[PDB]
């Protein structure tokens, strides 16, 4: 028993992190097969970052302009190209620690583990969700660019995030490993802001189920609702609409606990309308929304990798 | 910016996790050099749970009664010994992935990462604190015994916890890697209960300094307090006493933010009195006490967002 915010074990990803240096800029790279992936803004001076012409700045650059360091071994760069906002550096040595892996683009509400790195060295691991506004509430300092987010399935690492920047509110924005930003952001120094976020309804419901499974039941009640009526409540409280697909995904937890999703929506409806009356759920005074239904089942099942 | 429950990268520990089986019982072991460490209660059977005599149970075992499995490879046990509540199995192969490591016994309030494992296979990583009542608030299912807690400050793994059992309130108890339990607990299934737990005051203060570092001051006030008046108030909310050691430990955070420790004590006293009036601190609506001063310095910028 117990319920904790849990990250995937990070060892398979630790063996892929390297340090990439171009000019005065050092950040982190992901070394898979014979290619190192990192943010393309590594080629930019501070002057360039105001209005960068990445095409022109890159063709200027050459292989020898890039220093890649794996531990204390220099990787010789033998090729360089761009894919969207990611720079790809071909090196002369395939990473012998390359795990089974895929590049995956995730949807808002989905969670993943972040391996925060500095100077190519893993520093910490934590769990976070892609927010509805396409930011992540990360924990990153200067030099963290190029840190990656991932999920594991058995032996396969699914890389879904590379870190590029911090927004003025302190939240974070990045790309998938193909260099496509999450959210309406660009890799230049210009006015940019997180849009108004919403709460991830299906994940709150998932966590309410986790609470019931762990013996927290005070919020349950005799009432049920409909999707239409609940979604009017959701809109009122800046919760994401609940769809039929969300209900289907929560099916397992509904069966296990005996609380139909619309039964639990009636609990959440009341929590949104009345508050928690001084009580906590799973040790929180807020409605937690960064556990997916899968996360709840995996932690309450003991899945290993 | 930002602030998260941040664990250490677990790879160095992943490469030490094995499966240990004795009889019908399977759990996790820690393979360092040519020794596998696991909970000694792997040698218990159904009848042995209330009043096991581990000396008598163990003398009946040969080396080949212990099956150790590292991934797909069966390791051969060539010796065994019991140290307190840990079994040490000598194997014929030194672990080639052994990291630099040490064994440390921690004090209540200290934090560490836990690599939850099942059948020798890692499941997930999270942060925990040793509570004042010598339990931890983990996430552990059947077969998690032998999972370990650790820190990795400066490329050396400091192992500080091995999981042995779950108490009735859902919290967890275990030992250091020398097999000595944290707290008054024993590896018997006789009735045992965690003592009333308390909040780790020095850690809450560390987390309030983190919030200031990250740019939020709304909770401060114009007051100060004596250490004794602070403790007289805080203990009425079931907070642990704050000692001069704790005050000294908070020095660096006080220096970086310009807020005297006892002035941050005054703020905490008022937070306990008032609540947050619908606000949060670093994304939480409760006062968080599982970040230590060292953890805050590890994770936060050295430059306050003034
Ligand atoms: C090992 O994987 C397992 C891990 C738990 C998280 C399940 N540990 C045990 O089974 C352990 C073995 C004994 C010999 C130390 N027993 C317990 O943890 C046990 C609870 C289990 C059966 C779920 N706890 C226990 O016995 O606590 C003492 C006690 C007894 C009676 C009443 C209250 C408390
Ligand atoms: Cl009804
Ligand atoms: Na209901
Ligand atoms: Na010790």
Coordinates of C-alpha atoms and ligand atoms in Angstrom, one line a residue:
Chain A
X1 CA 0.0 0.0 0.0
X2 CA 0.9 3.7 -0.2
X3 CA 0.7 6.0 -3.2
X4 CA 3.5 8.2 -4.4
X5 CA 4.5 10.3 -7.4
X6 CA 6.8 7.8 -9.2
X7 CA 9.2 8.1 -12.0
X8 CA 10.4 5.3 -14.3
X9 CA 13.8 3.9 -13.5
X10 CA 16.3 6.1 -15.4
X11 CA 19.3 3.9 -16.0
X12 CA 18.5 3.2 -19.7
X13 CA 18.4 6.9 -20.4
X14 CA 21.4 7.8 -18.2
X15 CA 23.6 5.8 -20.6
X16 CA 22.5 8.1 -23.5
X17 CA 23.3 11.5 -22.1
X18 CA 26.3 13.4 -23.4
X19 CA 27.6 17.0 -23.3
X20 CA 27.4 19.1 -26.5
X21 CA 29.3 22.3 -26.8
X22 CA 29.2 24.8 -29.7
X23 CA 31.1 28.0 -29.1
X24 CA 30.4 29.3 -25.6
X25 CA 27.2 27.3 -25.3
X26 CA 27.2 24.0 -23.4
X27 CA 24.1 21.9 -23.0
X28 CA 23.0 18.2 -23.1
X29 CA 22.6 15.8 -25.9
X30 CA 20.9 12.4 -26.3
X31 CA 23.2 9.8 -27.9
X32 CA 21.4 6.9 -29.7
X33 CA 22.9 4.7 -32.3
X34 CA 25.5 6.9 -34.0
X35 CA 23.6 10.2 -33.6
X36 CA 23.5 12.9 -30.9
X37 CA 20.3 14.9 -30.6
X38 CA 20.2 18.3 -29.0
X39 CA 18.3 21.7 -29.3
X40 CA 19.2 23.6 -32.4
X41 CA 19.6 26.8 -30.4
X42 CA 22.9 25.5 -29.2
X43 CA 24.4 27.1 -32.4
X44 CA 23.1 30.6 -31.4
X45 CA 24.8 33.4 -29.8
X46 CA 22.7 35.7 -27.5
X47 CA 22.6 38.1 -30.4
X48 CA 21.3 35.4 -32.7
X49 CA 18.6 34.3 -30.3
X50 CA 16.7 37.6 -30.8
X51 CA 15.9 36.8 -34.5
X52 CA 17.8 33.6 -35.5
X53 CA 18.0 32.5 -39.1
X54 CA 18.7 28.8 -38.3
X55 CA 19.1 27.8 -41.9
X56 CA 21.9 30.5 -42.3
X57 CA 23.5 30.0 -38.9
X58 CA 23.7 26.2 -39.5
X59 CA 25.2 26.2 -43.0
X60 CA 27.8 28.5 -41.6
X61 CA 28.6 25.9 -39.0
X62 CA 30.7 22.7 -39.7
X63 CA 31.3 19.4 -38.1
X64 CA 34.4 20.7 -36.3
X65 CA 32.3 23.5 -34.6
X66 CA 30.7 20.9 -32.3
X67 CA 32.4 19.2 -29.3
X68 CA 30.6 16.1 -28.0
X69 CA 31.8 14.6 -24.7
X70 CA 30.6 11.2 -23.3
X71 CA 32.0 11.0 -19.9
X72 CA 35.6 12.0 -20.5
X73 CA 35.7 10.6 -24.0
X74 CA 35.4 12.9 -27.0
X75 CA 33.0 11.7 -29.7
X76 CA 34.2 12.8 -33.2
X77 CA 31.4 14.6 -35.1
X78 CA 31.3 13.5 -38.7
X79 CA 28.0 15.0 -39.8
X80 CA 25.4 17.5 -38.8
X81 CA 21.8 18.3 -39.9
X82 CA 18.6 19.8 -38.6
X83 CA 15.2 18.3 -38.1
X84 CA 12.7 21.0 -37.1
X85 CA 14.1 22.5 -33.8
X86 CA 16.5 19.6 -33.1
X87 CA 20.1 19.4 -34.2
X88 CA 21.4 16.0 -35.3
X89 CA 25.1 15.3 -35.0
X90 CA 26.4 12.1 -36.6
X91 CA 29.3 10.7 -34.6
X92 CA 31.8 8.1 -35.5
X93 CA 30.8 5.6 -32.7
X94 CA 27.4 4.0 -32.1
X95 CA 26.4 4.2 -28.5
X96 CA 26.9 0.7 -27.1
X97 CA 24.4 1.5 -24.4
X98 CA 21.7 2.4 -26.8
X99 CA 18.4 0.8 -25.4
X100 CA 15.5 -0.4 -27.4
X101 CA 13.7 2.9 -28.1
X102 CA 11.1 4.8 -30.1
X103 CA 10.4 8.5 -30.6
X104 CA 6.8 9.2 -29.5
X105 CA 4.8 12.4 -29.4
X106 CA 2.5 12.5 -26.4
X107 CA -0.9 14.2 -25.9
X108 CA -1.8 16.7 -23.2
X109 CA -2.6 15.0 -19.9
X110 CA -0.1 12.2 -20.5
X111 CA 2.7 11.9 -18.0
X112 CA 6.4 11.1 -18.4
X113 CA 9.7 11.0 -16.4
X114 CA 12.2 13.8 -16.9
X115 CA 15.9 13.1 -16.4
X116 CA 17.4 16.5 -15.5
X117 CA 21.0 16.8 -16.7
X118 CA 23.7 19.4 -16.5
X119 CA 27.0 19.3 -18.6
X120 CA 25.9 15.9 -19.9
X121 CA 25.6 14.4 -16.4
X122 CA 22.3 13.1 -15.0
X123 CA 21.4 15.0 -11.9
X124 CA 17.8 14.0 -11.0
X125 CA 14.6 12.4 -12.1
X126 CA 11.0 13.4 -11.6
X127 CA 7.5 12.8 -13.0
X128 CA 5.5 15.4 -14.8
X129 CA 2.5 15.8 -17.1
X130 CA 2.1 17.6 -20.5
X131 CA -0.3 20.3 -19.4
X132 CA -3.4 21.2 -21.5
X133 CA -1.6 24.4 -22.3
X134 CA 1.4 22.4 -23.6
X135 CA 3.8 23.5 -20.9
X136 CA 5.3 21.2 -18.3
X137 CA 5.8 22.2 -14.6
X138 CA 9.4 21.1 -14.6
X139 CA 12.3 21.9 -12.3
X140 CA 15.2 23.1 -14.5
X141 CA 18.1 25.5 -14.0
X142 CA 20.5 27.1 -16.6
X143 CA 22.4 24.3 -18.5
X144 CA 19.4 21.9 -18.4
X145 CA 18.5 22.3 -22.1
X146 CA 18.6 19.0 -23.8
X147 CA 17.3 17.0 -20.8
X148 CA 14.8 14.5 -22.0
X149 CA 11.5 13.0 -20.9
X150 CA 10.4 9.4 -21.5
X151 CA 8.2 6.5 -20.6
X152 CA 9.2 2.8 -20.5
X153 CA 7.2 -0.2 -21.8
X154 CA 8.9 -3.5 -20.8
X155 CA 12.3 -2.9 -22.4
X156 CA 11.5 -0.1 -24.8
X157 CA 12.2 3.5 -23.9
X158 CA 9.7 5.9 -25.5
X159 CA 11.4 9.4 -25.7
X160 CA 8.7 12.1 -25.8
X161 CA 10.3 15.4 -24.6
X162 CA 13.5 17.4 -25.1
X163 CA 13.8 20.5 -22.9
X164 CA 14.4 23.9 -24.7
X165 CA 13.3 26.9 -22.6
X166 CA 11.7 28.4 -19.5
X167 CA 8.8 30.8 -19.8
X168 CA 8.3 33.9 -17.7
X169 CA 6.0 32.1 -15.2
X170 CA 8.6 29.5 -14.5
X171 CA 7.0 26.7 -16.5
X172 CA 8.8 24.9 -19.3
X173 CA 8.5 24.3 -23.0
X174 CA 10.2 21.8 -25.4
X175 CA 9.9 19.6 -28.3
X176 CA 9.4 16.0 -29.2
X177 CA 12.6 14.2 -30.3
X178 CA 11.7 15.0 -33.9
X179 CA 12.1 18.7 -32.9
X180 CA 8.4 19.6 -33.1
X181 CA 7.4 22.0 -30.2
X182 CA 4.7 21.1 -27.8
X183 CA 2.5 24.2 -27.8
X184 CA 2.6 27.5 -29.7
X185 CA 6.2 28.3 -28.8
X186 CA 9.4 29.1 -30.8
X187 CA 13.1 28.9 -30.1
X188 CA 13.9 32.6 -30.2
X189 CA 14.2 35.3 -27.5
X190 CA 10.8 37.0 -28.1
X191 CA 7.7 37.7 -26.0
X192 CA 6.2 34.3 -25.1
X193 CA 3.8 33.3 -22.4
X194 CA 2.0 30.2 -21.2
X195 CA -1.7 30.4 -21.9
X196 CA -4.3 29.9 -19.2
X197 CA -4.1 26.2 -18.1
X198 CA -6.9 23.9 -17.2
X199 CA -7.0 20.9 -14.9
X200 CA -6.8 17.4 -16.4
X201 CA -10.2 15.9 -15.4
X202 CA -9.6 12.3 -16.3
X203 CA -6.4 12.2 -14.2
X204 CA -8.2 13.8 -11.2
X205 CA -10.7 11.0 -11.5
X206 CA -7.9 8.4 -11.8
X207 CA -6.4 9.8 -8.6
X208 CA -9.8 9.7 -6.8
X209 CA -9.9 6.0 -7.7
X210 CA -6.3 5.6 -6.4
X211 CA -7.6 7.2 -3.1
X212 CA -10.5 4.7 -2.8
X213 CA -8.1 1.8 -3.5
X214 CA -5.9 3.1 -0.7
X215 CA -8.9 3.4 1.7
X216 CA -9.8 7.1 1.3
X217 CA -13.6 7.2 0.9
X218 CA -15.0 10.2 2.7
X219 CA -15.8 12.0 -0.7
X220 CA -18.0 9.1 -2.0
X221 CA -21.8 9.7 -2.1
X222 CA -25.0 8.2 -3.2
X223 CA -25.4 10.3 -6.3
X224 CA -24.6 9.9 -10.0
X225 CA -24.6 12.4 -12.8
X226 CA -24.4 12.6 -16.6
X227 CA -21.6 13.6 -18.9
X228 CA -23.5 16.7 -20.1
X229 CA -24.3 17.9 -16.5
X230 CA -20.8 17.2 -15.3
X231 CA -19.1 18.9 -18.2
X232 CA -21.0 22.1 -17.4
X233 CA -19.5 21.9 -14.0
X234 CA -16.1 21.2 -15.5
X235 CA -16.3 24.2 -17.8
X236 CA -17.3 26.4 -14.8
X237 CA -14.1 25.3 -12.9
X238 CA -11.6 25.3 -15.8
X239 CA -11.5 21.5 -15.9
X240 CA -11.0 19.8 -19.3
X241 CA -14.2 18.3 -20.8
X242 CA -14.7 14.7 -19.9
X243 CA -15.3 12.6 -23.1
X244 CA -16.7 9.1 -23.6
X245 CA -13.2 7.9 -24.3
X246 CA -12.1 9.1 -20.9
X247 CA -14.9 7.1 -19.2
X248 CA -14.0 4.0 -21.2
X249 CA -10.3 4.3 -20.1
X250 CA -11.4 4.6 -16.5
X251 CA -13.5 1.4 -16.9
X252 CA -11.1 -0.9 -15.0
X253 CA -10.9 1.3 -11.9
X254 CA -14.7 1.6 -12.0
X255 CA -15.2 -2.1 -11.9
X256 CA -12.5 -2.7 -9.2
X257 CA -14.0 -0.2 -6.8
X258 CA -17.7 -0.3 -7.6
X259 CA -17.9 3.4 -8.3
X260 CA -19.1 4.0 -11.9
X261 CA -17.2 6.9 -13.5
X262 CA -20.3 9.0 -13.5
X263 CA -20.7 8.0 -9.8
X264 CA -17.2 9.4 -9.2
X265 CA -18.0 12.4 -11.3
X266 CA -20.7 13.2 -8.8
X267 CA -18.0 13.1 -6.1
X268 CA -15.8 15.4 -8.1
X269 CA -18.7 17.6 -8.9
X270 CA -19.3 18.0 -5.2
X271 CA -15.6 18.5 -4.4
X272 CA -15.5 21.3 -7.0
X273 CA -18.7 22.9 -5.7
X274 CA -18.1 22.6 -1.9
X275 CA -14.3 22.2 -1.5
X276 CA -12.7 19.6 0.8
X277 CA -14.0 20.8 4.2
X278 CA -10.6 20.8 5.7
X279 CA -9.9 17.1 4.7
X280 CA -7.2 15.7 2.5
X281 CA -7.1 13.0 -0.2
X282 CA -3.9 10.8 -0.4
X283 CA -2.2 13.5 1.6
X284 CA -3.0 16.4 -0.6
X285 CA -5.2 19.5 0.0
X286 CA -5.5 19.9 -3.8
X287 CA -7.1 17.7 -6.5
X288 CA -4.0 16.1 -8.1
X289 CA -4.1 15.8 -11.9
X290 CA -0.7 14.4 -12.9
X291 CA -1.5 10.7 -12.4
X292 CA -3.0 9.1 -15.5
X293 CA -5.3 6.1 -15.3
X294 CA -2.4 3.9 -16.5
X295 CA -0.2 5.4 -13.8
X296 CA -2.7 4.4 -11.1
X297 CA -3.0 0.8 -12.3
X298 CA 0.8 0.4 -12.8
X299 CA 1.6 1.7 -9.3
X300 CA -1.2 -0.4 -7.7
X301 CA -0.1 -3.5 -9.8
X302 CA 3.7 -3.3 -9.3
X303 CA 4.7 -3.4 -13.0
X304 CA 8.4 -3.8 -13.6
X305 CA 10.7 -3.2 -16.6
Chain B
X1 CA 12.7 27.5 -11.7
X2 CA 10.1 25.0 -10.5
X3 CA 10.4 22.7 -7.6
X4 CA 9.7 18.9 -7.6
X5 CA 10.1 15.8 -5.5
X6 CA 13.4 14.9 -7.3
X7 CA 15.0 11.5 -6.9
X8 CA 18.5 10.6 -7.8
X9 CA 19.1 8.9 -11.2
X10 CA 18.6 5.2 -10.3
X11 CA 20.8 3.5 -12.9
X12 CA 23.7 2.8 -10.5
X13 CA 21.3 1.0 -8.2
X14 CA 19.3 -0.8 -10.9
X15 CA 22.5 -2.6 -11.9
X16 CA 22.7 -4.1 -8.4
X17 CA 19.2 -5.5 -8.0
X18 CA 18.7 -9.3 -8.0
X19 CA 16.0 -11.8 -7.0
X20 CA 16.5 -14.0 -4.0
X21 CA 14.4 -17.1 -3.4
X22 CA 14.3 -19.4 -0.4
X23 CA 11.6 -22.1 -0.2
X24 CA 8.4 -20.5 -1.6
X25 CA 9.5 -16.9 -0.6
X26 CA 11.0 -14.5 -3.2
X27 CA 12.1 -11.0 -2.7
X28 CA 14.8 -8.5 -3.8
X29 CA 18.5 -8.5 -3.0
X30 CA 21.3 -6.0 -3.4
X31 CA 24.4 -7.3 -5.3
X32 CA 27.5 -5.4 -4.4
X33 CA 30.9 -6.9 -5.3
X34 CA 30.5 -10.6 -4.4
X35 CA 27.8 -10.2 -1.7
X36 CA 24.0 -10.2 -2.0
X37 CA 22.2 -8.4 0.8
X38 CA 18.5 -9.2 1.5
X39 CA 16.1 -9.3 4.4
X40 CA 16.6 -12.3 6.6
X41 CA 12.9 -13.1 6.7
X42 CA 13.2 -14.6 3.3
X43 CA 14.0 -17.8 5.4
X44 CA 10.6 -17.7 7.2
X45 CA 7.7 -19.9 6.3
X46 CA 4.0 -19.4 7.1
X47 CA 4.3 -20.8 10.7
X48 CA 7.5 -18.8 11.3
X49 CA 6.0 -15.3 11.2
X50 CA 5.1 -14.6 14.8
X51 CA 8.2 -15.8 16.8
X52 CA 10.9 -16.9 14.3
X53 CA 14.2 -17.9 15.7
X54 CA 16.5 -16.9 12.8
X55 CA 19.5 -18.6 14.2
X56 CA 17.6 -21.9 14.2
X57 CA 16.0 -21.3 10.8
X58 CA 19.3 -20.4 9.2
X59 CA 21.5 -23.3 10.5
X60 CA 19.2 -25.7 8.6
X61 CA 20.0 -24.0 5.3
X62 CA 22.8 -24.8 2.9
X63 CA 24.2 -22.4 0.3
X64 CA 22.2 -24.1 -2.5
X65 CA 18.9 -23.5 -0.7
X66 CA 19.3 -19.9 -1.8
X67 CA 18.5 -19.2 -5.5
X68 CA 19.9 -15.8 -6.6
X69 CA 18.9 -14.6 -10.1
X70 CA 20.6 -11.6 -11.8
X71 CA 18.5 -10.9 -14.8
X72 CA 18.6 -14.2 -16.6
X73 CA 21.7 -15.5 -14.9
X74 CA 21.6 -17.8 -11.8
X75 CA 24.3 -16.7 -9.4
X76 CA 25.9 -19.5 -7.3
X77 CA 25.8 -19.0 -3.5
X78 CA 29.1 -20.1 -1.9
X79 CA 28.5 -18.8 1.6
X80 CA 26.0 -17.1 3.9
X81 CA 25.9 -15.2 7.2
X82 CA 23.4 -13.2 9.1
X83 CA 24.1 -9.6 10.3
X84 CA 21.3 -8.3 12.5
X85 CA 18.2 -8.5 10.3
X86 CA 20.1 -8.8 7.0
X87 CA 21.2 -12.0 5.3
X88 CA 24.5 -11.7 3.3
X89 CA 24.9 -14.3 0.5
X90 CA 28.5 -14.6 -0.8
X91 CA 28.3 -15.5 -4.6
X92 CA 30.9 -16.7 -7.0
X93 CA 30.7 -13.7 -9.3
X94 CA 31.5 -10.1 -8.3
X95 CA 28.9 -7.7 -9.7
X96 CA 30.7 -6.0 -12.7
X97 CA 28.3 -3.1 -12.4
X98 CA 29.1 -2.4 -8.7
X99 CA 29.2 1.4 -8.2
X100 CA 31.3 3.4 -5.8
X101 CA 29.2 3.0 -2.6
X102 CA 29.0 3.2 1.1
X103 CA 26.5 2.2 3.8
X104 CA 25.2 5.1 6.0
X105 CA 22.6 5.0 8.8
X106 CA 20.5 8.2 8.5
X107 CA 18.6 10.2 11.1
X108 CA 14.9 11.1 11.2
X109 CA 14.2 14.0 8.8
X110 CA 16.7 12.8 6.2
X111 CA 15.5 12.0 2.7
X112 CA 16.5 9.4 0.1
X113 CA 15.4 7.9 -3.2
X114 CA 13.7 4.5 -3.2
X115 CA 14.0 2.1 -6.1
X116 CA 10.8 0.0 -5.8
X117 CA 11.5 -3.5 -7.2
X118 CA 9.6 -6.7 -7.7
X119 CA 11.3 -10.0 -8.6
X120 CA 14.6 -8.3 -8.9
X121 CA 13.3 -5.9 -11.5
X122 CA 12.9 -2.1 -10.9
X123 CA 9.4 -0.7 -11.0
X124 CA 9.8 3.0 -10.2
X125 CA 11.7 5.6 -8.3
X126 CA 10.5 8.1 -5.7
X127 CA 11.6 10.3 -2.8
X128 CA 10.9 9.5 0.9
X129 CA 11.9 10.9 4.2
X130 CA 12.7 9.0 7.4
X131 CA 9.8 10.2 9.6
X132 CA 10.3 11.3 13.2
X133 CA 8.6 8.0 14.2
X134 CA 11.2 6.0 12.2
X135 CA 8.7 4.9 9.5
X136 CA 8.6 6.0 5.8
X137 CA 5.6 6.8 3.7
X138 CA 6.5 4.5 0.7
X139 CA 4.6 2.8 -2.1
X140 CA 5.3 -0.9 -1.6
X141 CA 3.3 -4.0 -2.7
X142 CA 3.8 -7.7 -1.9
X143 CA 7.3 -8.7 -3.0
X144 CA 8.9 -5.3 -2.6
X145 CA 11.0 -6.4 0.4
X146 CA 14.7 -5.9 -0.3
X147 CA 14.1 -2.7 -2.2
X148 CA 16.6 -0.1 -1.1
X149 CA 16.8 3.6 -0.4
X150 CA 19.9 5.6 -1.3
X151 CA 21.4 9.0 -2.1
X152 CA 24.0 9.7 -4.8
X153 CA 25.8 12.9 -3.7
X154 CA 29.0 13.2 -5.7
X155 CA 29.0 10.0 -7.8
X156 CA 29.0 7.7 -4.7
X157 CA 25.9 5.7 -3.8
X158 CA 25.1 6.0 0.0
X159 CA 22.8 3.1 0.8
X160 CA 20.6 4.0 3.8
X161 CA 17.5 1.8 3.7
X162 CA 16.3 -1.7 3.0
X163 CA 12.6 -2.4 3.0
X164 CA 11.3 -5.1 5.3
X165 CA 7.6 -4.6 6.3
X166 CA 4.4 -2.6 6.3
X167 CA 2.7 -1.4 9.4
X168 CA -1.1 -1.2 9.8
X169 CA -1.5 2.4 8.9
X170 CA 0.0 1.7 5.5
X171 CA 3.5 3.0 6.4
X172 CA 6.7 1.1 6.1
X173 CA 9.6 0.0 8.2
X174 CA 13.1 -1.4 7.5
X175 CA 16.7 -1.4 8.2
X176 CA 20.1 0.2 7.3
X177 CA 22.3 -2.0 5.2
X178 CA 23.9 -3.4 8.4
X179 CA 20.5 -4.9 9.1
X180 CA 19.6 -2.6 12.1
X181 CA 16.0 -1.5 12.1
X182 CA 15.1 2.1 12.1
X183 CA 12.9 2.7 15.2
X184 CA 11.7 0.1 17.7
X185 CA 10.4 -2.4 15.1
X186 CA 11.3 -6.1 14.7
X187 CA 10.9 -8.6 11.8
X188 CA 8.1 -10.5 13.5
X189 CA 4.3 -10.3 12.6
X190 CA 3.4 -9.6 16.2
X191 CA 1.3 -6.5 16.8
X192 CA 3.4 -3.3 16.2
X193 CA 2.3 0.2 15.5
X194 CA 4.1 3.4 14.5
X195 CA 4.1 6.1 17.1
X196 CA 2.2 9.3 16.6
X197 CA 4.1 11.1 13.8
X198 CA 5.1 14.7 13.7
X199 CA 6.0 17.3 11.1
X200 CA 9.7 17.8 10.3
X201 CA 10.0 21.5 11.2
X202 CA 13.5 22.0 9.9
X203 CA 12.4 20.7 6.5
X204 CA 9.3 22.9 6.3
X205 CA 11.6 25.9 6.9
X206 CA 13.9 24.7 4.1
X207 CA 11.0 24.5 1.8
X208 CA 9.8 28.1 2.7
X209 CA 13.3 29.3 1.9
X210 CA 13.0 27.4 -1.4
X211 CA 9.8 29.3 -2.2
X212 CA 11.6 32.6 -1.5
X213 CA 14.5 31.6 -3.7
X214 CA 12.0 30.9 -6.5
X215 CA 10.4 34.3 -6.0
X216 CA 7.5 34.2 -3.5
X217 CA 7.4 36.1 -0.3
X218 CA 3.6 36.5 0.4
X219 CA 3.8 34.4 3.7
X220 CA 6.5 36.5 5.4
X221 CA 5.6 39.0 8.2
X222 CA 7.2 41.8 10.1
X223 CA 7.8 39.7 13.3
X224 CA 10.5 37.6 14.8
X225 CA 10.5 35.0 17.6
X226 CA 12.8 33.4 20.1
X227 CA 13.7 29.8 19.5
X228 CA 11.9 28.8 22.7
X229 CA 8.7 30.7 21.9
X230 CA 8.7 29.2 18.4
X231 CA 9.0 25.6 19.8
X232 CA 6.3 26.3 22.4
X233 CA 3.9 27.2 19.6
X234 CA 5.0 24.7 16.9
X235 CA 4.6 21.7 19.2
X236 CA 1.0 22.6 19.6
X237 CA 0.6 21.7 16.0
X238 CA 2.5 18.4 16.4
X239 CA 5.7 19.9 14.9
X240 CA 9.1 18.5 15.9
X241 CA 11.2 20.8 18.1
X242 CA 13.7 23.0 16.3
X243 CA 17.2 22.8 17.7
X244 CA 20.2 25.1 17.4
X245 CA 21.7 22.4 15.1
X246 CA 18.7 23.0 12.8
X247 CA 19.1 26.7 13.0
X248 CA 22.8 26.4 12.0
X249 CA 22.0 24.0 9.1
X250 CA 19.6 26.7 7.7
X251 CA 22.4 29.3 7.7
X252 CA 23.2 29.1 4.0
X253 CA 19.6 29.4 3.0
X254 CA 19.1 32.3 5.4
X255 CA 22.2 34.0 3.9
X256 CA 21.1 33.6 0.3
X257 CA 17.7 35.0 0.9
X258 CA 18.5 37.6 3.6
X259 CA 15.8 36.2 5.9
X260 CA 17.1 35.4 9.4
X261 CA 16.2 31.9 10.5
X262 CA 14.1 33.0 13.4
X263 CA 12.3 35.5 11.1
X264 CA 11.4 32.5 8.9
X265 CA 10.3 30.8 12.1
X266 CA 7.9 33.7 12.7
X267 CA 6.5 33.3 9.3
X268 CA 5.9 29.5 9.9
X269 CA 4.1 30.3 13.2
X270 CA 1.7 32.6 11.3
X271 CA 1.1 30.1 8.5
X272 CA 0.1 27.5 11.1
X273 CA -2.2 30.1 12.6
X274 CA -3.8 31.4 9.4
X275 CA -3.5 28.7 6.7
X276 CA -2.9 29.9 3.1
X277 CA -6.2 31.7 2.4
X278 CA -6.6 29.9 -1.0
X279 CA -2.9 30.4 -2.0
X280 CA -0.3 27.7 -2.6
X281 CA 3.5 27.5 -2.0
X282 CA 5.5 25.8 -4.7
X283 CA 2.3 24.3 -5.9
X284 CA 1.2 22.8 -2.6
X285 CA -1.8 23.7 -0.4
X286 CA -0.1 22.1 2.6
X287 CA 3.2 22.7 4.4
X288 CA 5.7 20.2 2.9
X289 CA 8.2 18.6 5.1
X290 CA 10.1 16.0 3.0
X291 CA 12.7 18.4 1.5
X292 CA 15.8 19.0 3.6
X293 CA 18.0 22.0 3.6
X294 CA 20.5 20.0 1.6
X295 CA 17.8 19.0 -0.9
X296 CA 16.8 22.6 -1.4
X297 CA 20.3 23.7 -2.1
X298 CA 20.7 20.7 -4.4
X299 CA 17.7 21.7 -6.5
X300 CA 17.2 25.5 -6.3
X301 CA 19.3 28.2 -8.1
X302 CA 22.0 29.8 -6.1
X303 CA 20.6 33.2 -7.2
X304 CA 17.3 34.3 -5.5
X305 CA 14.5 35.6 -7.7
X306 CA 14.3 38.9 -5.8
Ligands
LIG1 C1 8.1 -8.4 2.0 O1 8.0 -8.2 0.7 C2 6.8 -7.9 2.7 C3 6.6 -6.4 2.2 C4 5.3 -5.7 2.6 C5 5.1 -4.3 2.0 C6 4.2 -6.6 2.1 N1 7.0 -7.9 4.1 C7 6.4 -8.8 4.9 O2 5.6 -9.6 4.4 C8 6.6 -8.8 6.4 C9 7.3 -10.0 6.9 C10 7.7 -10.0 8.3 C11 8.3 -11.3 8.8 C12 8.6 -8.9 8.7 N2 5.4 -8.6 7.1 C13 4.7 -7.5 7.0 O3 5.0 -6.5 6.5 C14 3.4 -7.5 7.7 C15 2.2 -7.1 6.8 C16 2.0 -8.0 5.6 C17 1.5 -9.3 5.9 C18 1.1 -7.3 4.6 N3 3.4 -6.5 8.8 C19 3.4 -6.9 10.0 O4 3.4 -8.0 10.4 O5 3.4 -5.8 11.0 C20 3.3 -6.2 12.4 C21 1.9 -6.2 12.8 C22 1.3 -7.4 13.2 C23 0.0 -7.5 13.6 C24 -0.7 -6.3 13.7 C25 -0.1 -5.1 13.4 C26 1.2 -5.1 12.9
LIG2 CL1 -28.6 10.8 -8.3
LIG3 NA1 -21.7 9.2 -6.1
LIG4 NA1 24.9 1.2 10.3

